[PDB]
Structures are given as C-alpha cells and as structure tokens.
Design a protein around this ligand. Structure first.
Ligand SMILES: Cc1cncc(-n2c(=O)[nH]/c(=N\c3cc4cn(C)nc4cc3Cl)n(Cc3cc(Cl)c(F)cc3Oc3ccc(C#N)c(F)c3)c2=O)c1
Ligand SMILES: Cc1cncc(-n2c(=O)[nH]/c(=N\c3cc4cn(C)nc4cc3Cl)n(Cc3cc(Cl)c(F)cc3Oc3ccc(C#N)c(F)c3)c2=O)c1
Lengths: 301, 300
C-alpha cells in the first residue's frame, strides 16, 4: 500500500551522462553508442547567447573545439552535426553502458522521470509531468542544462526530454531528443513567458481512484453527473475538458474500484466547489494532477 | 529553481539487488562483496510466519536450501548466518558492481531514498522520511520485502533501511542493515500497530526556508516568538519540540535568507493557527515535514 511520486530506476541513464564543453560554455550530454547528444546552445559564447545564428556559429567550429569528458575519460570528437536544437558529436568510442533506448516524444499530461545532472554527474531523480502549456515544473539550478527525462519499459529507455532553460515563472522548457522544443520556446537568451496552463483532469481522476484503493474515501458521495455537466464546471475551474476516451482509459480503475467514472466526476465537482475543508487525500491538501492512469496502475495494486 | 521530492541516483543500488528464495518463500536481497543480506523471514514457510523461532528454523537449514538469483546467474551459497533480523548468505562470487558502501542507522526525522524491488528487479525510486514513530509512509506492494533505503555521499552508499512488512494503517516497518528494527516491531506475521506520530518541526521550518530561497514570502510576518511559547503552541498542534540543535541546524538557512529562526517560528505559529486559507507554499497546500535542512541546502 501507499502512493508516492515514483521515478524509474535511473541507473541505465546514469551510464550515459557526460560533460560537453565548447570554449568556456559547458553542459551535460547524453552518450549512446558512438554519439553524444547535447543542447546546441553549448556552441554559444557569452555574447552569442542573446541572438545566435547556430548555423553560422557551427560552421566556425571544428571537431577539436569540443571537449567531451566521461568521468575522467576524454572522448575524442570525430564528427559534429546539428539536428534542430540538439548537437550530435560523433566520438571514437561507443559507450559500453549504452542501454536499449528509443527517442520518443511525449504528449502533454504524460509523465516521465527526470535525472538532474551537473558537470556530467547525476545528482537527483524525480517525477515530472509535461504541463498542458508544454513546460514542466521541475527542479533545476544553473548547470542542469542538458539533463534528460525518460521512461523505462521492459529494459528499454525511452528518452523524451532534454532540458534547456528556466523561464521567469520558475518552470522549465526543453526539447525532445531530436532537438524539437516542447511548446513555443527557442534556445535564445531572451525573456519568454509560459502560456496559460490548465489542470490535467484525467490525472486527478486517476489519483482519486488511487486514493480509494489506498483507504481515503471521505471525498466519495452517492451523487452522479453527466459527462457534460461536469465539463461545464471543470471549465469554470480551469480544468481540461474530459473526453469519452479519457473515460475509457479510466475503465480499469473504475472496475477494480467499482466506482463509475461519472461518479468520480461528481465527487470532483464536489471537491472543486467546496474545497477540502482541512481534509487531505493521499497526504495532499490539493488535487494532484501529475499522476497518469499508468502511474496509478503501476504503483497501486 | 523549483523544489521537488528528489531521490538519489539509484544506479549504484540497482547494481546490487538480487532475489533470494528458500522453500517457496521469496524476497529481495542486497549483494555486496560476497555477502547477500535479506530479511530473515525468508527462512519461514507459510506455517512458520505466525510465531517463528528463527534460531530453530535456521539450524534446520543448509546452504543448498538457499537459491540466490542475479539475472540468470545462479549464485552459490557457501555460508549462512543470522544478524539479528537480517540473514547473511555468503556466496562464492563477489559482486563486481559493489560500490563503496556503509551501514548506517538514521534518527527519526531524517530522509532517505527507497528502491522498490520485486523478485530482484528494481521498479521505482522515491524519497521517504523516518517518521517520529519509527514507521515510514512508503509505497510497497507484496514482494517488496528486502528493498532498501539509502543515502549517497560522494559515491558512498549509506544503506539505512531494509523493508520488512506493512502495518494495518498502511505504514511500513523495517530494520537497519544489522537487523535491528526501527521502533517497537518484530518480524512476525501478527497485527502490530504503529505508534502515535508527531510532525517534524525542524523539517517544516527548513521547507519554509526553501520557500523563501525560492521567492514565496507571503507566510512571513514581523512577529517574533521565544523557543518556549512556540514549543507550547506546537505541542498543541502535535508538533515535535524544537531543540537548540534543531535551531542551530537551521542557522545556514537563516543566514542565506536573513530570517531569524525565531521569526520563522512566529510565521509557523501563525500558519498553524490560521491554516493556509486557500493558499499554497512550493505547490503544497499543507505544511510539509519530509524535507530536512540538508535536503533543502542540496536542492537550493
Ligand atoms: C535555474 C536554471 C534552470 N534550468 C536551466 C538554467 N540555465 C542554465 O543552467 N544555463 C543557461 N545558460 C548557460 C550559461 C552558461 C555559463 N557557462 C559558463 N556555461 C553555460 C551554459 C549554459 Cl546552457 N541557461 C540559459 C539558457 C540556456 C539555453 Cl540551452 C538557451 F538556449 C538559452 C538560455 O538563455 C535563456 C535566458 C532566459 C530565458 C527566459 N525566460 C530563456 F528561456 C533562455 C539556463 O536557463 C537555469
Ligand atoms: C503490501 C506490502 C508491502 N510491504 C511488504 C509486504 N509484505 C510482503 O511483501 N511479504 C510479506 N510476507 C511474505 C510472503 C511471502 C510469500 N512468498 C511466496 N514469499 C513471501 C515472502 C514474504 Cl516476506 N509480508 C508479511 C511479513 C513480512 C515480514 Cl519480513 C515479516 F517479518 C512479517 C510479515 O508478516 C506480517 C503481517 C502483518 C503485519 C501487520 N500489521 C506485520 F507486521 C507482519 C509483507 O508485509 C506487503
């Protein structure tokens, strides 16, 4: 029993974190087979960061301008290329710890595990959700640029996030492993505001099912509501609209629990209109929207 | 910026998780050098679990009664011994992935990372605190017995918890790595109640410092309080008394923030008396007590 923000075992990814340096600019890189992937921003000098032209800057560099350190082992760069906002450094040694991996992009609302790294050394691991506005409320300090998010399925690591920058609000923006940003952001040292965010409704409902599975039932009621009467209130509270697909993915939890999906929605209507009144659910005084149905099914029984 | 429940990189520990089976009983073990440590409960059959005498059960066993699997590699048991509630199985192959490690016990109120393991395969990692009543509000399912909590300091893994069982309330109990239980519990399949818990005050204060370090200051006030009037208001909110150690440990945070420790105490008193009023701190609507001063300094 119990329910926590659980991340995937980070060992397989620790085996790939390295340090990439160009001039005095330095950040984290990901070593897979004989390629090191890192944010292209590393090729920028302090004065280039404001308004860079990455093609123009990359032409002016050579393979020996790129210092790649894996622990104390200096890898030799033998090739370089740009793939959107990510730089690919071909090196003479294939990472022997290279796991089975895939480069997959994730949907807003999907969760993933973040391995916070600095100078090539992992320092922490935690769970994040892709916000509907394509940012993530992460935990990053200066020097985390280049850390990766990932998921693991049957021994295969699907890397989905490369960290790039922190926005004014304190949330974080980044790319997938092909260098395509999540959301309307560019790798440029300029003020870029995060869009208006929303609450991931399917996630809240899955977390409520986890609560019932774990003994918290005070939020339950006998009421019911239509999928449309609930959508009207959710919109009032800046919640994402609930489709009938979202209902289908919630099916298994409705079965194991025996609480109709619409009944949970009526309880959520209830919770959004009366608050909580000094009560808690799974130890939280807010409605948590960063647990997917997959997360619940995995950690719960 | 940002603040989350961050665990330590679990790779060094994933390299040591193995599976231990005795009869039909099976659980997780920790393989370091040529020793595999696991809950001694594994020597129990279904019928011994209720009221065991582990000395009698252990004398009746031999080395070839212990099947140890690391992947598809069967490790061979060459010796066995009991270390309080921990079983030690000496095997003929030393773990090549053995990191620099230590066996350390933790005080109530300290945190650590948990690697949830099943049949020898790790499945997740998360942060936990040793509660004041010597339980942990963890996340464990059947088969997690033998998973370990741990801390990492400069490549050195301080193993501090071996998971043993789940109590009626949903809390979890276990031992240190020498087999000495945390709190008033025994490795016996019987109803065992968790004690009355209290909220970790020094930790709450550290989390509020983290909020200040991250820009949220609405909870601050100009009032001040003595260590004694604040301890009185806390004890009524089921908060732990704040010692002068707990005050000194917060010094660095008070300094980098410029908020007197007693000034937090006045703000925490106000928060405990008026609640939060639909407001939040670091994304939480309640007072978090599972971040230590060290955790905050590490993340901030
Ligand atoms: C707290 C925190 C959390 N996460 C990441 C960070 N972080 C960092 O750690 N480094 C960091 N630049 C560096 C400074 C270095 C100095 N040396 C010696 N080496 C260095 C290497 C790097 Cl990369 N930048 C800014 C930044 C990164 C990228 Cl990739 C980008 F393309 C544009 C950037 O400029 C901005 C500036 C403002 C906004 C806005 N609004 C924006 F969107 C982008 C950042 O934000 C910081
Ligand atoms: C959900 C969950 C989370 N965490 C751990 C668990 N968990 C488990 O996974 N296994 C588990 N027994 C096993 C069953 C097995 C069947 N096979 C084939 N092999 C097995 C190996 C084990 Cl170990 N036991 C009970 C348990 C463990 C230990 Cl060590 C102990 F010393 C006393 C125990 O009995 C109790 C029973 C009740 C209370 C109370 N109140 C108590 F204090 C102790 C448990 O609680 C379950």
């Amino acid at each position: 029993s119990g329910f926590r923000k659980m991340a995937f075992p980070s060992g397989k990814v620790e085996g790939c974190m390295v340090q990439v340096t160009c001039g005095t600019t330095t950040l984290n890189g990901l070593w897979l087979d004989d390629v090191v992937y890192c944010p292209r921003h590393v090729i920028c000098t302090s004065e280039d960061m404001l308004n860079p032209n990455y093609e123009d800057l990359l032409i002016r560099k050579s393979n020996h301008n790129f210092l790649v350190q894996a622990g104390n082992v200096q890898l030799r760069v033998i090739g370089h290329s740009m793939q959107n906002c990510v730089l690919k450094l071909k090196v003479d040694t294939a990472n022997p710890k290279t796991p089975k991996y895939k480069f997959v992009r994730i949907q807003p609302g999907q969760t993933f595990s973040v391995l916070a790294c600095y100078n090539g050394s992992p320092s922490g691991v935690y769970q994040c959700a892709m916000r509907p506005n394509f940012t993530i409320k992460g935990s990053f300090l200066n020097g985390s640029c280049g850390s990766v998010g990932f998921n693991i399925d049957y021994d295969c690591v699907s890397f989905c996030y490369m960290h790039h920058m922190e926005l004014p609000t304190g949330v974080h923006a980044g790319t997938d492993l092909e260098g395509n940003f999540y959301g309307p952001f560019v790798d440029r040292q300029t003020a870029q505001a995060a869009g208006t965010d929303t609450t991931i409704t399917v996630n809240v409902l899955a977390w409520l099912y986890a609560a019932v599975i774990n003994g918290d039932r005070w939020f339950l009621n006998r009421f019911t509501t239509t999928l449309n009467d609930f959508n009207l209130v959710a919109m009032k509270y800046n919640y994402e609209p609930l489709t009938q697909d979202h209902v289908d993915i919630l099916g298994p939890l409705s079965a194991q629990t025996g609480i109709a999906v619409l009944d949970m929605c009526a309880s959520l209507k209830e919770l959004l209109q009366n608050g909580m009144n000094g009560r808690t659910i799974l130890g939280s005084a807010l409605l948590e929207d960063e647990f997917t149905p997959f997360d619940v099914v995995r950690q719960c029984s």
